[PDB]
Design a binder for this molecule. Sequence first.
Ligand SMILES: CCCCCCCCCCCC(=O)O
Ligand SMILES: CCCCCCCCCCCC(=O)O
Ligand SMILES: [Ca+2]
Ligand SMILES: [Ca+2]
Lengths: 39, 39, 25, 25, 25, 25, 25, 269, 269, 237, 237, 60, 250
Amino acid sequence: CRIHEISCGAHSTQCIPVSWRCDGENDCDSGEDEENCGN
Amino acid sequence: CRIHEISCGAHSTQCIPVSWRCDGENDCDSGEDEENCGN
Amino acid sequence: AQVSRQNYFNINYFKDAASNGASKL
Amino acid sequence: AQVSRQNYFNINYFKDAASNGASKL
Amino acid sequence: AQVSRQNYFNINYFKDAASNGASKL
Amino acid sequence: AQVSRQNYFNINYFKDAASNGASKL
Amino acid sequence: AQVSRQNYFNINYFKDAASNGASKL
Amino acid sequence: LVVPNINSSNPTTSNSAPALDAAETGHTSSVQPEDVIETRYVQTSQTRDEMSLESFLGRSGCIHESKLEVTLANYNKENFTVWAINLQEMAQIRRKFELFTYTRFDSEITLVPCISALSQDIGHITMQYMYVPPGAPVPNSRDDYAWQSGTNASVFWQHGQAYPRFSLPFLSVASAYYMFYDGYDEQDQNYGTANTNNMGSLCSRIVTEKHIHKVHIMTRIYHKAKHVKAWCPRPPRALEYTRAHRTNFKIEDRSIQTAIVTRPIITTA
Amino acid sequence: LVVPNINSSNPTTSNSAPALDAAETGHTSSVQPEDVIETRYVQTSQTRDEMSLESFLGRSGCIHESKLEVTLANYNKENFTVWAINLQEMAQIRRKFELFTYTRFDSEITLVPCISALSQDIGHITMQYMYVPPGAPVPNSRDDYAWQSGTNASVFWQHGQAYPRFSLPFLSVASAYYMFYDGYDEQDQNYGTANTNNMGSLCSRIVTEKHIHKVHIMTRIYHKAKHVKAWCPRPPRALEYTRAHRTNFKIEDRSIQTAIVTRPIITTA
Amino acid sequence: GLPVFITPGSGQFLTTDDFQSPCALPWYHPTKEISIPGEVKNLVEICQVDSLVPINNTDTYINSENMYSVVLQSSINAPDKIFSIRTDVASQPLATTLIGEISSYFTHWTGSLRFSFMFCGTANTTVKLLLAYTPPGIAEPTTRKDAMLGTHVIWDVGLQSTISMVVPWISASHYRNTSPGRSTSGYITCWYQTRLVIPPQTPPTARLLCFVSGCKDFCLRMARDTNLHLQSGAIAQ
Amino acid sequence: GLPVFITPGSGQFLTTDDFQSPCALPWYHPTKEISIPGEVKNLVEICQVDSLVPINNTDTYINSENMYSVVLQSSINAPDKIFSIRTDVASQPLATTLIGEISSYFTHWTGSLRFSFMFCGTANTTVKLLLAYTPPGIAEPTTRKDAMLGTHVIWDVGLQSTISMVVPWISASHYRNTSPGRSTSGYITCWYQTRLVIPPQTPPTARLLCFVSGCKDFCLRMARDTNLHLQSGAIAQ
Amino acid sequence: GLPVFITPGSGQFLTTDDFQSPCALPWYHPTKEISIPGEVKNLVEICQVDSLVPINNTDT
Amino acid sequence: RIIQITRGDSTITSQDVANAIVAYGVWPHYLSSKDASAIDKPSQPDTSSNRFYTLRSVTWSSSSKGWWWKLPDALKDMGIFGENMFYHYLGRSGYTIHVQCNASKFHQGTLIVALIPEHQIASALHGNVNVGYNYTHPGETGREVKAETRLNPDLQPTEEYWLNFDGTLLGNITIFPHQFINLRSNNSATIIAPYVNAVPMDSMRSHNNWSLVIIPICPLETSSAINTIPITISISPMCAEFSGARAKRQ
Ligand SMILES: CCCCCCCCCCCC(=O)O
Ligand SMILES: CCCCCCCCCCCC(=O)O
Ligand SMILES: [Ca+2]
Ligand SMILES: [Ca+2]
């Protein structure tokens, strides 16, 4: 669950690719994939 | 049987890609592909 | 067999009730 | 039914007015 | 030739016994 | 309509002159 | 035209000798 | 199927009043244009063909969206779905049929697969859909024997194959499907259409053996009704649907909202 | 194919007792509703069409899953499979046919290829399936001459081609297939259906010449029976199947497990 | 193989198509149909039924029966307007009614409408109203005169509580849109011809209901999705 | 090329379809069929056969014949229940029987059932039982009275060992589900009408078997996969 | 399945073709046609009409 | 303008009415030899059941909002019809419903009497909640529109009359068999209904084919001393049939 691409914003469960990283849609269950963005 | 991707958890026979590395399913005959994981 | 509407042919190619097209009125 | 032009067959396979091919004259 | 069930056409397009569809009763 | 050569069927499915297959002799 | 074997239809769609299916006996 | 025409009328001045009646009866006062206005003579063309039941429910709509997420690792232990069959899950449709108390008909089911790619390539995907009737064994692993389907009806779809489709005869053990149902269980429980409309379940499972690409399969389900009949019309629905097989409508901290618009005053619309 | 109707009956009080009989005979006491209860008169519609043999075994099911693993290196020396033909390998199906002693029928075989990708791309795959009758030469290398198939029947499948399928006439050198067989060899050995049901073998082999992608081909095999007849029904199976062409059931350190559920007491079910 | 030719449109999936399709349940035998009273064959059967009109749709009454009736005063001595509404079947407030809702399922309509009124005051209470329909092409009528110059009916309450009147179909084209824009099909104003009147010891007010239905005339066409009902976010199973 | 048009559903593979398909063995000539006694044309032929009911399914007897018979006592002087079972053909313990197992291959059923009983005690042993069927919609009967108020049969053992009785098909709908849920098709309780009785010098107990079969009535539909048999992990070749 | 054979040209889209095609509005009933004076059946009808010629086409 | 109905040993009359309406236009009748499934001789109690049973009057006031009873049930205690109902599993019947309610030339109000097939109410709560058997089987009493909290109340049907208790709008209620009682005109309604349901016969206990509903669409106003009149309901089954006879259930 790495390979430098796919990676959930969570310590466990599965993994979500880089395309949904701070995009506005919530993908990983924890909701951390969208936490502390806005740069 | 390398090319930085495919590689059996065995000294001989064929080779199994990286996708079945400590995944829960046993792919290489030796069973070493699933030996000493849980990090 | 072929008919008139609101001519054309149409036989049911299928061996079963349901497979048929829409009903008439 | 089949006709002459400027022979050949042609029945309308569709149950509706519009689906038909081009008109005649 | 076409029949009634539980009408429709059906001829066997194949030259052999087995190729035919399901039997009747 | 179907004929003999050097039997078989063949109607022109198209509404136009040119679309037809090869001529006869 | 359709026949019996070891019924079914079969006309030759092709304008030539060779194109035909297998012979009879 | 035609509509009558409108006949020319003339200035009556009779002792009989057809306009005047009494709705208390429960009948719809049968008065026609002519009776109330020196009218013309018209040869109406209009046709009610379209308004036939067969033309109404005669259109295919969606009833379910089954999303399946493929998971490399434990392949054979997941990557499969299940579904309680029913129309109750998709407003559009549901609202219509829920326009009559009872209905009878055959169905045309049509599938629509969509493979959302997650790796750079998709490879070769192949799905399977099995219809498991109530009583039949439900699958429990992408590799359960049930998928052998020695008798259940399954349909296979692979990538690049046109949408599959099939027809279904009127199921049920009754004369018609229950759209509503003021009754209970043999154990006085479960008030609702749920009490009956048990058609079994629909399952899928990716067939392609263990592989390399993570992907998402989204198969939508469409349904058209054929050869129809329906009884006892009911008033149409008015509020968003909340749950299957139940009429309930009150929602978590939100007003009861209809579709009736409001106005300032009634002497101006 | 219809079912008789139920006639109205009346309060008998006769000297003859049709209810009373004797099962020792081996006959199924022919008593009907009417004879035992002032009954109504019903015009039954019910039909047994579906319960016909042709409707039963008339459904396609799976009988075999042939997994082939491609191996770059020694290409022409492997990458091919073999298979002892028979229905004995897949419960679902087997259980059914094993419902009669003898059966006769033609078969509709249907294939289902699945290419599990192992490299980033698949390229262009092309399989071949040859039917090798008992006596014919078996292949021994992805490049054996046998695959020329000057007479055997082979069917080719390439990627993106719809599932292949073909029909098969009732084989065997008898009047019907043996579902069971209390007999032996000419060398008093091999007690079992294995003694006869030798239909030959089914082989495949990837055709596409030496290439670049490691991949897995998984071809499942489905079979529907047509034009059927069957004799001497037998009681159905009760325990998991263990081995082909044998009835055996005892399994390695595990109880004899049926399907009969147990209860606490018989005066409450 | 019979030489064939593929066609533009092939293999597509059309929600409204109509084709044959193998069956998944060969030899199944539908349960025999039976005697179910009150059948239905054509939606029009419904539109021909009187449904009540939510005349009083002010933020005030909005979610109670009171929205369905109107109030008449014994203290109004003069040509006063009482209420009015647009005609266009799928308009407000008609849209929520039987006929309405259904019309809302199509695009084009045509026919005459049947408006009925029922007076609910006391048995000794009497009045004389004036239901009027003013043909589109102008503006809502402000005075009685201005109103009655069109199609109308002087209804006198007496014994029979009801009275139905009709809104002739009077359009330019043969059909009209279910969902109008800025366009209209006229309005139905209602006025005091005389005055509500009562004896001594009686409620000075009376209720007035209103129903609507289509005539032998009426008819729809062009199947489309209703707008009077939505689904925002999934439904629980 | 004859202009054609592709259809929604094309190229799919349906396990239940029914189409023609070229043959791989052209000119093959099936071996001539012959005279095989006892043929079969329709599954119903079977359901019409009496199979034994595993009445006694207690963890005790569970894997021996003794599960197939019941025991009657010469020491019970009173209206005592003996045994009972649900009716629903595919229920317990019926499911394991001929008819049962097969019913388990479909989804819907309908018809009357034929229950037969055979007494096995001594030739001088005599009794009088009471087989009874209590229509669903209630609960298993606890007393004899409560039971016999339904369809029943006072069977007296004498010479003919057997006695068949019937469970009329008495449902709301025309068909019922093979696999029930919490629902039922009634129960068959069985009681002591009189009392088992014997002379001096005889076994104080007697066996009672039970068979079941369908009537001319009976019938199934909706092909589905049996649930009374599985396959966990491959089979050896 | 009736044995068929695909044809060179199949599945193409020709702007001038002429084929049948399912309808998206089953059971629709066109508005009845009526008496519209001055109809047209063939373009030639027009060419037979005198139109004025821009003889004097100088930049002026 | 008058009327006289007879059933069993009972007879209703009404000096002033709106000529009775027949449910979906199909007079009641017994079960066709061609439809039935029940394969046993049905019992037809006749005059001892197909009679007129009168309920328990409820009171209408300047503030009542509605009421409703479900059918069968409501009758579950009314003699033989009642008994039979429980002694058997299956039952079938159609009835005649006469709703009476006199007043005076010096009142005003209007009730909507509607008979509804398969009336599935909705509980008045959010989330997975259903309705409790006990609450949809009141009995000859009925269920009134009371606004003031209940018990183990999450199994309670809503109290939103104006939505017909189900997500539809009163005002389209007319789509069902119904009459109107408008004090200034009539003084009684009458509905005759056949057996409607998708099967020959059903269980009298576990299901109510119908459901009577009464809603004051028009405030009961008056200046007289009596400002509260009662509303009574009388019902009579027709062509009663029972099957699968066994013990009486509780
Ligand atoms: C295999 C595809 C499943 C489609 C099943 C259609 C059945 C509709 C029956 C209506 C039951 C209900 O009220 O929800
Ligand atoms: C080429 C495809 C092979 C399919 C062969 C079907 C033959 C079935 C004969 C039954 C023998 C047995 O008892 O297992
Ligand atoms: Ca995201
Ligand atoms: Ca592994």
